[PDB]
Design a protein around this ligand. Structure first.
Ligand code: SF4
Ligand SMILES: [Zn+2]
Ligand SMILES: [Zn+2]
Ligand SMILES: [Zn+2]
Lengths: 698, 335
């Protein structure tokens, strides 16, 4: 297409000149546009030069990038007939990319890495003094296994079928292939990870092209990278964790004390640098981004041992129980909290180095370490690292007396979000920053200050196939401002609002997806709707997303929605616009052809996390009470806009309520304001003109 | 030759007042005219009416070449009320049971007039769509306003991988246009199969009405057609005789074949200043100028429909009259 070549000519001009480019793409029409241009810019330069680094936001976009790369290789092996050096690696999760917990453990949780380190150290125990390895170890690091990926594309699903037929291990293949540096596909929770990105950055070895995919929730990952709640039950875990270290120091000082004494001399000489260098293929500890923390020349509790280090920790946790034992609403400065700590116990200014050495020590010392006890130590050690350094932008908040039973909840606020995005500019050049759910894109020069260029979507044609209307008067224009309040004011109007939804769904019963800014509006009408005619004569079955949406429940509601439209039935997808599963897969008639939105998306106000980030960005960019209610409300609405635009071949109608949407912008701003009963006759025309103009424009 | 199975929607979705006075009062009314459009151009073809009422499929007209059986079947539907929901699976499985007596030499067609937006099928409807391709059944659905994803797969997989048969109607004038194209056959590219048909006897026009004679009814008659094989004076019809399974057509099949062989040569509309001929018609006398928009820049220009088969000048009126009925351009018969 000529519109796809407009962004491709900009991608061929920025990858060889600029270092970071904010390129806007239309929804459902920019997936393979930058995919083929990334392999063409490498083919125009050198094919072993800068490899492609993909950064998705969900696991679905990781899976959708693999099938498009197969189409890139099929277009390069059929139009050319030459099989070059293949690439592509499916860096997914650990519970999905495994074989051993899917046979004996039968658990698909976050404990798949615990059996991984038990088999890694079990193979280490079987190759030093002596369970053993696993099903297929001591063979995945061979040279023939390193050549199974530049010759054949085996990523994720193709590699999981390859590790069963050839009897291999999916963990040691992918971990040995980050050093090979292929087309790496991963999500946003791995690049800004304080336990994973320290290992990823030592294997890619830089000098590549970072492809930011759907870069609109970048400010959310930097907040989600920190902020851990301490809801007082970890104090019971830290109390039982402190007594376990007392029995472990009693067990270490009863017989085999030379293993701890030689480790004490190794920490008094080689410190943490030699301790990390000697430790290989074992369970790594935790830190607050060692590539961003930058600290050397440490000391082990001032030349002391583990018996003196656990005394400071037991001194530390009782002070933490002392500070949590407070009244209600109280803010805390991270520097002033450290001063009040030193008035209680002189723990110096470096507990960041007093914990990461002792976490690696107890793994080497205690062999049968408890799961809940050692994780209780890591929750304290992650907090001890954040109170030692990184005080600029940091803030400690206390939850108030909320019945008070659930009152002792301690949380720390993250620093600036520009700090986490900082080291990706000096490590990589020509970082392609793309997102299809941004309108406008001027907040990214504002918030997160980096020098970049701005390019908009230069693709807008065939407005007769992209119906973009909006509803204003709902028969009386009263339920539009009624949903604007946070509290469910006047439920009789909401029962009148829910009465209009049965009338709106009975007009076009051909795939309906309803989003919500909160689950309170879903739970308000579901108690006594008194209106099931659409749930018995139109949509029949009901697909409502709950607040506690299970992964299996979201999977079963998605497949049955595809089973409803493939049987001539149609279903109502009652989802949350602020909830999980942002979707993105459409391009068919099985999706909801008419998408409904209840008002505008809102945010949870009157919270200490919001009031802290309000005054933090007030000093930075002075965007108080503006972008927090509009730029955040747009991106939660733009996830609903990315599903209607499913290419130029498929049509779709997206209606928007209220009147506050006119103050913001939108992707392809062609919007006509009409009433609710007026659009019922307009959509009946749009569902018949588009069926007659499809064969006219071809 | 043809054995069309009419599938009509008779449910509560047809109770809406989209048409005048409603959907059901125009679907039944225009289908009677479609019976008149079908048996005239195809006098030796078959028809079958299957309604979809109360979630089922009811057979109101048996498969027969008599046009009066399908008229009186539609006169009983307008008396009652369309209720329930359409059942596409029960209607197609009933259409499969009637097209199995129809041989492979006779073309099997299914026309669906679907004015609803939601159907009620028992089992999987995708097992019924693939069955129509296995026995080669050409299915055509006429959907109202919005499109159904089921009818896109039904009008494509049963139609040689081509979706162009699921048409969307928007007016009552456009609904009669669908009955004109469905009255005409579908000479496609097919799949290149063998075809051979025989046993076609001729009907002797007998007019004996004294004590009468009837081999298919045993009643009084004012004259019936005598079969050339079993020698039976049954009912006068151009279909098959009901006593030895032999045909009894005449010039009715010849008129259908003449319309089928009618390629209809449209006359080339050349101007009077370009064809260098006066305004005249080969069929009548069109001595008036065609174009007359401008002063003398169009009035002297005009247009003369010159048929390329005999270089005869004509107008726009007789060019559509010669292509509709009779022979295409009367100058072709003279050399
Ligand atoms: S070697 Fe691989 S399959 Fe075996 S336990 Fe470790 S991660 Fe799981
Ligand atoms: Zn006979
Ligand atoms: Zn004439
Ligand atoms: Zn002629």
């Amino acid at each position: 297409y000529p519109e796809q070549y407009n962004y491709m000519c900009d991608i061929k001009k920025t990858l060889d000149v600029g270092g970071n480019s904010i390129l806007e793409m239309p929804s459902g029409t920019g997936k393979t546009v930058s995919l083929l241009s990334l392999t063409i810019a490498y083919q125009m330069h050198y094919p072993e030069h800068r490899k492609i680094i993909y950064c998705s936001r969900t696991m679905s976009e990781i899976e959708k990038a693999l099938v498009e790369l197969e189409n890139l290789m099929d277009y390069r092996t059929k139009e050319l007939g030459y099989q070059e050096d293949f690439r592509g690696l499916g860096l997914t999760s650990r519970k999905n990319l495994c074989l051993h917990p899917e046979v004996s453990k039968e658990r698909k949780g976050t404990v798949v890495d615990e059996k991984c380190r038990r088999m890694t150290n079990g193979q280490a125990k079987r190759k030093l003094e002596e369970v053993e390895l696993c099903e297929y170890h001591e063979n995945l690091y061979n040279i023939e296994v390193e050549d199974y990926l530049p010759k054949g594309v085996f990523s994720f699903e193709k590699l999981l079928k390859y590790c069963e037929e050839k009897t291999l291990c999916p963990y040691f293949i992918v971990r040995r292939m980050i050093s090979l540096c292929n087309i790496i596909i991963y999500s946003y929770h791995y690049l800004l990870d304080p336990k994973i990105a320290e290992r990823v950055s030592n294997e890619v070895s830089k000098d590549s092209i970072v492809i930011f995919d759907e870069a609109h929730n970048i400010d959310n990952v930097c907040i989600e990278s920190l902020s851990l709640d301490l809801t007082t039950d970890a104090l019971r875990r830290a109390t039982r964790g402190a007594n376990a270290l007392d029995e472990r120091i009693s067990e270490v000082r009863k017989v085999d004390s030379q293993k701890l004494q030689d480790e004490y001399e190794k920490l008094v000489q080689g410190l943490x640098x030699x301790x990390x260098x000697x430790x290989x293929x074992x369970x790594x500890x935790x830190x607050x981004x060692x590539x961003x923390x930058x600290x050397x020349x440490x000391x082990x509790x001032x030349x002391x041992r583990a018996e003196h280090f656990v005394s400071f920790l037991k001194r530390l946790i009782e002070y933490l129980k002392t500070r949590m034992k407070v009244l209600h609403v109280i803010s805390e400065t991270p520097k002033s909290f450290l001063q009040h700590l030193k008035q209680l116990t002189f723990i110096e200014r470096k507990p960041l180095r007093f914990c990461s050495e002792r976490l690696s020590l107890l793994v080497r010392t205690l062999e049968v370490t408890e799961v809940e006890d050692f994780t209780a130590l890591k929750d304290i050690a992650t907090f001890a690292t954040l109170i030692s350094t990184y005080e600029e932008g940091f803030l400690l908040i206390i939850e108030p007396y909320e019945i008070a039973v659930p009152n002792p909840i301690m949380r720390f606020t993250c620093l600036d979000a520009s700090i986490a995005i900082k080291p990706v500019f000096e490590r990589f050049s020509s970082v392609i920053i793309t997102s299809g759910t941004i309108s406008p894109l001027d907040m990214y020069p504002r918030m997160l200050n980096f020098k970049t260029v701005l390019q908009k979507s230069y693709a807008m044609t065939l407005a007769k196939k992209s119906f973009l209307p909006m509803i204003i008067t709902k028969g009386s224009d009263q339920v539009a401002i009624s949903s604007r309040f946070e509290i469910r004011n006047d439920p009789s109007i909401v029962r009148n609002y829910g009465s209009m939804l049965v009338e709106f769904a009975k007009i076009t019963p051909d795939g309906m997806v309803v989003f919500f800014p909160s689950y309170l509006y879903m739970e308000s009408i579901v108690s006594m709707w008194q209106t099931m005619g659409i749930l018995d004569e139109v949509w029949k079955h009901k697909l409502i997303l709950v607040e506690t949406p299970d992964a299996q429940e979201t999977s079963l509601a998605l497949e049955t929605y595809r089973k409803a439209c493939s049987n001539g039935r149609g279903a109502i997808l009652l989802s949350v616009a602020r909830g999980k599963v942002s979707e993105g897969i459409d391009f068919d008639h099985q999706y909801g052809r008419t998408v409904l939105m209840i008002g505008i998306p809102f945010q949870y106000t009157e919270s200490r996390i919001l009031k802290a980030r309000l005054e933090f960005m007030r000093e930075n960019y002075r965007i108080r009470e503006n972008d927090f209610l509009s730029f955040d409300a747009m991106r939660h609405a733009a996830q609903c806009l990315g599903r209607v635009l499913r290419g130029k071949d498929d049509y779709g109608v997206m209606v928007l309520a209220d009147r506050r949407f006119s103050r913001k912008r939108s992707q392809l701003p062609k919007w006509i304001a009409q009433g609710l009963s007026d659009a019922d006759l307009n959509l009946s025309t749009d569902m018949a003109i588009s069926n007659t103009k499809q064969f006219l424009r071809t | 030759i043809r054995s069309l199975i009419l599938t009509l929607d008779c449910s509560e979705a047809m109770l809406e007042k989209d048409l005048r006075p409603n959907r059901h009062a125009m679907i039944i009314q225009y289908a009677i005219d479609f019976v008149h459009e079908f048996f005239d151009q195809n006098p030796i073809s078959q028809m079958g009416i299957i309604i979809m009422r109360n979630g089922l499929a009811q057979l109101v007209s048996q498969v027969s070449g008599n046009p009066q059986d399908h008229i009186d079947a539609l006169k009983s539907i307008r008396k009652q009320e369309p209720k329930g929901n359409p059942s596409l699976q029960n209607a197609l499985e009933m259409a499969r049971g009637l097209l199995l007596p129809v041989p492979a030499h006779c073309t099997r067609e299914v026309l669906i007039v679907f004015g609803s937006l939601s159907t009620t099928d028992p089992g999987d409807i995708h097992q019924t769509i693939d069955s129509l391709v296995s026995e080669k059944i050409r299915v055509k659905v006429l959907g109202l306003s919005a499109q159904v994803a089921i009818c896109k797969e039904l009008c494509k997989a049963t139609n040689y991988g081509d979706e162009s048969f699921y048409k969307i109607l928007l007016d009552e004038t456009h609904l009669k246009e669908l009955f004109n194209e469905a009255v005409t056959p579908x000479x496609x590219x097919x799949x290149x199969x063998x075809x051979x048909x025989x046993x076609x006897x001729x009907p002797t026009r007998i007019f004996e009405d004294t004590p009468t004679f009837c081999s298919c009814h045993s009643k009084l008659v004012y004259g019936g057609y005598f079969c050339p094989n079993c020698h039976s004076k049954v009912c006068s019809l151009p279909t098959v005789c009901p006593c030895c399974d032999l045909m009894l057509i005449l010039x009715x099949x010849x008129x259908x074949x003449x319309x089928x062989x009618x390629x209809x040569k449209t006359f080339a509309e050349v101007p009077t200043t370009e064809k260098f001929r006066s305004e005249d018609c080969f069929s009548c006398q069109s001595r008036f100028p065609x174009x007359x928009x401008x002063x003398x820049x169009x009035x002297x220009x005009x247009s003369r429909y010159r048929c390329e088969d005999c270089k005869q000048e004509f107008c726009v009126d007789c060019d559509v009259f010669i292509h509709e009925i009779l022979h295409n351009c009367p100058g072709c018969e003279s050399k």
